Amino acid sequence: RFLKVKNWETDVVLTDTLHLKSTLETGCTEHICMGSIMLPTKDQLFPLAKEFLDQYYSSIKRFGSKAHMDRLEEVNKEIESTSTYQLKDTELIYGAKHAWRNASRCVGRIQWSKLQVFDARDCTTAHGMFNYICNHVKYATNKGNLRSAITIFPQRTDGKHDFRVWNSQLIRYAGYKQPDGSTLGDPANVQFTEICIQQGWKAPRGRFDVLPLLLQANGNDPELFQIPPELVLEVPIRHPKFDWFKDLGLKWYGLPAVSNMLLEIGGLEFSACPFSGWYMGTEIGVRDYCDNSRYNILEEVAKKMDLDMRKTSSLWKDQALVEINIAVLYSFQSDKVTIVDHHSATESFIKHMENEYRCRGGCPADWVWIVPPMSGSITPVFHQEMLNYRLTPSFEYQPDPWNTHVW
Amino acid sequence: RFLKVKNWETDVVLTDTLHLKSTLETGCTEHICMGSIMLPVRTKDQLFPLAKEFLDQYYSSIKRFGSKAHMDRLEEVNKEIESTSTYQLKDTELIYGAKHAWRNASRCVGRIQWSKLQVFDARDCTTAHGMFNYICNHVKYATNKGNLRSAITIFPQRTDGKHDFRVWNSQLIRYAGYKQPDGSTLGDPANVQFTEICIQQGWKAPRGRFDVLPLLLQANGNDPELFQIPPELVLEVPIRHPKFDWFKDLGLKWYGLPAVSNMLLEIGGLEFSACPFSGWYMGTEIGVRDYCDNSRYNILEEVAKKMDLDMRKTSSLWKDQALVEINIAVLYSFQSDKVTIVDHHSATESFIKHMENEYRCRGGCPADWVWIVPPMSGSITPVFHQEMLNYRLTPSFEYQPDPWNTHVWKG
Numbered sequence: 001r002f003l004k005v006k007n008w009e010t011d012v013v014l015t016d017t018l019h020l021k022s023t024l025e026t027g028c029t030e031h032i033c034m035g036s037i038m039l040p041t042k043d044q045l046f047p048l049a050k051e052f053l054d055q056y057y058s059s060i061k062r063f064g065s066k067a068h069m070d071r072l073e074e075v076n077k078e079i080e081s082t083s084t085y086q087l088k089d090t091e092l093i094y095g096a097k098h099a100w101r102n103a104s105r106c107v108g109r110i111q112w113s114k115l116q117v118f119d120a121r122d123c124t125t126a127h128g129m130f131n132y133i134c135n136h137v138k139y140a141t142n143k144g145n146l147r148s149a150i151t152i153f154p155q156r157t158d159g160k161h162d163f164r165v166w167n168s169q170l171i172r173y174a175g176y177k178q179p180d181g182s183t184l185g186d187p188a189n190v191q192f193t194e195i196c197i198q199q200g201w202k203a204p205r206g207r208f209d210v211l212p213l214l215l216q217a218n219g220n221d222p223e224l225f226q227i228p229p230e231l232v233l234e235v236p237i238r239h240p241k242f243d244w245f246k247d248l249g250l251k252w253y254g255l256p257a258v259s260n261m262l263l264e265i266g267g268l269e270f271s272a273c274p275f276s277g278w279y280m281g282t283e284i285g286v287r288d289y290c291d292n293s294r295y296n297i298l299e300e301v302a303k304k305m306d307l308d309m310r311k312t313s314s315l316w317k318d319q320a321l322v323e324i325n326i327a328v329l330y331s332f333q334s335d336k337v338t339i340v341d342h343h344s345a346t347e348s349f350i351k352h353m354e355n356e357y358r359c360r361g362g363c364p365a366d367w368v369w370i371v372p373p374m375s376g377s378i379t380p381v382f383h384q385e386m387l388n389y390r391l392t393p394s395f396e397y398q399p400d401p402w403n404t405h406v407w
Numbered sequence: 408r409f410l411k412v413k414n415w416e417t418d419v420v421l422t423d424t425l426h427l428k429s430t431l432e433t434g435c436t437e438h439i440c441m442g443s444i445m446l447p448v449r450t451k452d453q454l455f456p457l458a459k460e461f462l463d464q465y466y467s468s469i470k471r472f473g474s475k476a477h478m479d480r481l482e483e484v485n486k487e488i489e490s491t492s493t494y495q496l497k498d499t500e501l502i503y504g505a506k507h508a509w510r511n512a513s514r515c516v517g518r519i520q521w522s523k524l525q526v527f528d529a530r531d532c533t534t535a536h537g538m539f540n541y542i543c544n545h546v547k548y549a550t551n552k553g554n555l556r557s558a559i560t561i562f563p564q565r566t567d568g569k570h571d572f573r574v575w576n577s578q579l580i581r582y583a584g585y586k587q588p589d590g591s592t593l594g595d596p597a598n599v600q601f602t603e604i605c606i607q608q609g610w611k612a613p614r615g616r617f618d619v620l621p622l623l624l625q626a627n628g629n630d631p632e633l634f635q636i637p638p639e640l641v642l643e644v645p646i647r648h649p650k651f652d653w654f655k656d657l658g659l660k661w662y663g664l665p666a667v668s669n670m671l672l673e674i675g676g677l678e679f680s681a682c683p684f685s686g687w688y689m690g691t692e693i694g695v696r697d698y699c700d701n702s703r704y705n706i707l708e709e710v711a712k713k714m715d716l717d718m719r720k721t722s723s724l725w726k727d728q729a730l731v732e733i734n735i736a737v738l739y740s741f742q743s744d745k746v747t748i749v750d751h752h753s754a755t756e757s758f759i760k761h762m763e764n765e766y767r768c769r770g771g772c773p774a775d776w777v778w779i780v781p782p783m784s785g786s787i788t789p790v791f792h793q794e795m796l797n798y799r800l801t802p803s804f805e806y807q808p809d810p811w812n813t814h815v816w817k818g
């Protein structure tokens with residue numbers, strides 16, 4: 001019950017005791033593993049607060065101290081009357097950093113304690129939200145020297161006043177159904193690009209059209225906002241060997257800033273909390289160019305490489321995928337925009353695992369998601385046994401707003 | 408209660424009722440997933456339930472559930488247990504069991520072939536020499552001059568755990584691993600331990616880089632014995648590259664027949680501790696793991712040098728780039744010699760078809776995503792985007808401890 005995990009490349013063994021703090025469920029049972037499934041009141045709220053506040057005050061080495069019990073009774077009394085409660089700034093920051101720290105699917109968590117937290121809990125309007133997001137974006141980009149950030153809009157109250165950023169990421173390209181069959185722009189975002197038009201967006205109908213922001217504050221009909229272009233840093237994609245690679249007319253944006261998840265701290269629910277860091281190369285090149293429901297430039301790259309595309313066993317897809325990913329990293333590094341290759345970041349994660357087992361007794365991890373989408377076996381996380389379990393504070397999934405909004 | 412999985416690349420959903428037949432425990436709990444853990448003498452007290460269950464399955468498969476042939480067989484196995492404390496499978500039952508063991512192998516991507524398994528009943532074997540002759544015929548039959556045919560050879564079942572039959576090799580054909588004084592390894596680093604046991608048991612090692620290891624065979628719980636597979640029975644393929652003519656000069660070769668020998672076949676409560684089984688290679692098993700894993704032959708950096716790659720920063724992706732070429736050369740060498748091999752794209756596509764077919768005509772197909780996804784180019788194969796349900800069905804192939812850890816040495 002004090003589980004162990006083994007790295008089979010190095011024989012390192014770590015003993016996991018952190019998992020016995022786990023609260024939520026995984027979806028798995030004694031009889032069935034779901035490790036690869038994508039998505040599984042006043043009386044409930046107070047224990048959730050006690051638990052969070054207990055771990056908060058131990059983290060600062062004041063468990064059982066005067067300040068601890070007073071803060072507990074303070075929160076205790078506010079739940080009684082107000083039915084909820086508000087986090088002190090210090091807890092807000094702790095909670096945001098530990099939701100990233102507990103993000104069992106995130107490979108970049110070695111940076112978790114350097115997060116920049118922007119308290120936007122005083123926001124009241126979509127224009128307000130837009131101001132906060134533009135500030136987040138500018139701070140995060142930092143002229144290419146990217147910095148981790150999260151901006152936290154007001155907590156849920158009764159589900160009727162939800163703050164929601166309707167974009168899945170703050171910065172994403174547009175996707176348009178072409179009359180003939182295929183897709184122009186980016187096929188992931190075709191339905192959202194519809195909604196923006198459905199809401200009043202003048203789509204330029206190019207390939208790399210930065211989508212507008214669709215901001216929803218206090219539960220009202222959301223509003224369209226154009227991010228100032230000078231805040232959207234983009235990297236034109238070129239290959240350090242193949243001159244013809246520029247001709248494909250490819251670029252990506254520098255700032256990955258995920259905006260559709262829900263942040264849960266001490267039982268409180270922050271449905272608007274866009275957070276950002278920086279890209280691993282494969283997130284753009286393997287996934288955001290080469291997945292069959294994405295750009296499928298794989299064929300053109302290999303065509304332009306005059307590779308034998310007549311049978312899968314020439315591995316021409318793999319060979320193109322490598323080149324594309326070499327190009328994505330070359331371009332970002334050439335323009336001094338932060339990016340991490342998948343060898344770099346998996347080795348960091350292993351180091352971070354080491355540190356978590358050493359000074360925390362464990363580290364929840366979702367092997368299925370930590371292993372990069374190419375070259376998995378030659379990265380050091382492949383041979384790393386991991387234990388997956390759900391800790392609080394956390395980032396959670398939430399329904400898309402456009403299935404729920406009382407319009 | 409029914410369960411659903413979604414393929415996110417195609418939006419195809421499938422409903423699994425077959426997990427309800429699951430009994431063995433996965434290692435996971437409601438609060439902890441052990442989905443990435445490598446590894447998460449039986450009395451008649453609990454053997455007839457296991458027998459009845461298997462026999463219920465078998466007679467369902469032949470649509471004779473509840474027939475007099477079915478009830479009589481139950482009654483026959485019944486008396487044989489209380490009287491002998493074990494029981495014997497009919498040939499039919501043994502063949503069903505071995506096929507369904509493979510069909511239930513949730514980590515195996517090659518299961519589209521599962522019904523075509525050639526089952527060799529070696530349950531009359533009694534000695535190590537007897538085993539050597541059974542294995543030699545397996546190898547010849549399965550190889551078939553490069554037109555590989557999957558087979559399994561099933562040796563006698565465990566009785567009291569003190570008379571086990573064991574193949575001590577992890578595979579029938581593997582290359583020797585030699586640890587040098589200077590700390591380097593000659594041959595296959597994966598086999599250094601087994602090689603030393605062989606040498607200690609009296610094997611005269613050629614001490615080369617691709618020495619086929621001797622068979623180490625154990626019958627009836629006796630001390631294991633060494634035998635050299637005849638070299639004309641070991642089909643090998645020298646590794647060359649279709650564009651690089653310096654690749655042949657790395658002097659690499661690999662053998663054609665993957666044949667796993669260290670696992671335990673469980674059928675209806677009986678344990679078959681020695682049951683080597685073979686099929687044919689997916690290319691990445693040689694190209695990605697057998698050559699490029701940091702703890703294996705690790706010709707990665709030598710291939711990168713001959714390719715004159717930027718080996719300074721990892722972000723030149725030289726490792727990925729050399730990996731692709733090495734897998735290109737493995738597929739090319741095998742196809743050039745008409746030795747059966749499958750690339751990882753072809754095989755993941757087949758498994759998806761297989762998996763979909765299994766959901767429709769069986770109500771489920773247990774599958775270990777961690778293992779099914781290929782160890783390179785994972786996301787550009789259709790299993791990466793495929794949700795999977797993992798559960799243990801019997802008959803099954805199980806792991807078992809290395810015999811040299813548990814053996815009682817006669818002397």
Ligand code: HEM
Nearest residue numbers: 100103105106107108148149150275276277278279280395
């Ligand atoms: C700083 C560099 C970072 C890198 C390289 C990184 C990398 C990744 C990767 C590769 C994934 C896997 C999903 C996929 O590949 O499609 C992921 C998931 C995730 N990231 Fe990180 N990340 C970073 C920063 C952050 C930050 C700052 C946060 C929040 C404060 C965060 C929160 C998450 C969460 C919650 C998930 C999992 C979401 C889910 O369960 O669906 N990440 N990340």
Ligand code: HEM
Nearest residue numbers: 509512514515516517520557684685686687688689692804
């Ligand atoms: C004929 C073509 C076959 C192919 C291409 C194939 C491929 C694979 C691969 C790639 C793995 C992953 C293991 C690794 O990569 O380290 C695997 C696992 C496995 N294979 Fe298959 N296989 C084939 C036939 C068979 C046959 C005939 C059997 C037995 C009758 C079998 C039994 C298994 C089992 C039991 C596992 C799971 C290993 C475990 O649980 O540790 N396979 N297979």
Ligand SMILES: CCCOc1ccc(-c2ccc3c(C)cc(N)nc3c2)cc1CN
Nearest residue numbers: 168256257258260275276277278279280283
């Ligand atoms: C629904 C299937 C996709 O799931 C995913 C997949 C990935 C991420 C994710 C989240 C944050 C990231 C940050 C901060 C930096 C970075 N470099 N990468 C990230 C990737 C979120 C989700 C949830 N939408």
Ligand SMILES: CCCOc1ccc(-c2ccc3c(C)cc(N)nc3c2)cc1CN
Nearest residue numbers: 445665666667669670684685686687688689
């Ligand atoms: C705990 C270590 C897991 O390792 C492994 C790794 C691989 C296989 C395996 C087994 C059979 C195969 C056949 C018939 C064909 C083929 N092409 N590949 C196979 C690969 C088994 C095990 C379990 N002994």
Ligand SMILES: C[C@H](O)[C@H](O)[C@H]1CNc2nc(N)[nH]c(=O)c2N1
Nearest residue numbers: 036037368369370791792793794
């Ligand atoms: C079906 C499968 O579980 C799903 O596609 C997951 C698998 N692992 C992943 N891993 C990462 N890093 N990112 C992903 O989007 C996914 N997708």
Ligand SMILES: C[C@H](O)[C@H](O)[C@H]1CNc2nc(N)[nH]c(=O)c2N1
Nearest residue numbers: 382383384385443444445777778
């Ligand atoms: C830690 C991890 O579970 C382990 O290294 C597994 C992962 N998946 C694998 N998948 C395959 N096909 N072969 C393997 O050897 C492994 N190793």
Ligand SMILES: [Zn+2]
Nearest residue numbers: 028033435440
């Ligand atoms: Zn699980």
